[PDB]
Design a protein around this ligand. Structure first.
Ligand SMILES: COc1cc2ncnc(Nc3cccc(O)c3)c2cc1OC
Length: 283
């Protein structure tokens, strides 16, 4: 913490505050994260993430454990997807770029998932982009090792009390982000766990044993939940073509076991014509 000249506070996260900082030694600019004695288990878990390198994952540079304090040093990126989406609010993000970012994110998740590492809290603020047209996932693996908290991207099984969620929860969140980029409106903007759940039910229909075997036996499932019918996807995400809609529906299946995997999603027809355009960024 003495070797860094904190520039600005980049924002608070689920596990701590992140600052843009300059390494007094190397002179390099990095993202410094102060985790909110430090469990040895976490120490070892973190060290593991340090050897998890991939083009679409924010690189963990150093783990500083001193004075019973824990700081993580990450590579610094140009902007986050939420800020980019806001700046593109009036015209929306061009489809070629949306398709490019989704393709890369799926590559990143396929990599994490193959190493059995889940995110569990994907959201646009956690996705970082640079001037080169790349996009990377931040916070990967911190959930395992370690007021107004956004619930918009949380999978149904987590809201229903399932304690052993799988990699499928990340696919759900990505599905929600995908729809948001296309329509420019959050898909399920709930303000509470039950409101979130009901917004999901009102759009995709109240789940039952037919579409999701075992759902009525979930810890927080109530037989008294209202019975809403499923809406047409053409209504939910109007501007998306049929290949896009078919992919999205597979990412938003209620049953975690039927939900498409990142690996299989990479082979979907939607990515047939994928390219890598450069975004116009205002830094
Ligand atoms: C130019 O702005 C930003 C640049 C960033 N560069 C690297 N990491 C970030 N965040 C990060 C890294 C690991 C865990 C975590 O919770 C968050 C950033 C966020 C920014 O803006 C929000």
């Amino acid at each position: 913490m003495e070797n860094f000249q904190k520039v600005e506070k980049i924002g608070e996260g689920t596990y701590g505050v992140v600052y843009k900082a300059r390494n007094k030694l190397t002179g390099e600019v990095v993202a410094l994260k102060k985790i909110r004695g430090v469990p040895s288990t976490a120490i070892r878990e973190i060290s593991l993430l340090k050897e998890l390198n991939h083009p679409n994952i924010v690189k963990l540079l150093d783990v500083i454990h001193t004075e019973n304090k824990l700081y993580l040093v990450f590579e610094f990126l140009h902007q986050d997807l939420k800020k980019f989406m806001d700046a593109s609010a009036l015209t929306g993000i061009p489809l070629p770029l949306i398709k490019s970012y989704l393709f890369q994110l799926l590559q990143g998740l396929a990599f994490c998932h193959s190493h059995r590492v889940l995110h569990r809290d994907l959201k646009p603020q956690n996705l970082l982009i640079n001037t080169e047209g790349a996009i990377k996932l931040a916070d990967f693996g911190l959930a395992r090792a370690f007021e107004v908290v956004t619930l918009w991207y949380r999978a149904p099984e987590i809201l229903l009390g399932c304690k052993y969620y799988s990699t499928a929860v990340d696919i759900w969140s990505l599905g929600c982000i995908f729809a948001e980029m296309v329509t420019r409106r959050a898909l399920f903007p709930g303000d509470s766990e039950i409101d979130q759940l009901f917004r999901i039910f009102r759009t995709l229909g109240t789940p039952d044993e037919v579409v999701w075997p075992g759902v009525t036996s979930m810890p927080d499932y109530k037989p008294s939940f209202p019975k809403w019918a499923r809406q047409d996807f053409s209504k939910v995400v109007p501007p998306l073509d049929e290949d896009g809609r078919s992919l999205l529906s597979q990412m938003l299946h209620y049953d975690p076991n039927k939900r498409i995997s990142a690996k299989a999603a990479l082979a979907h027809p939607f990515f047939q014509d994928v390219t890598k355009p450069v975004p116009h960024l205002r830094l």
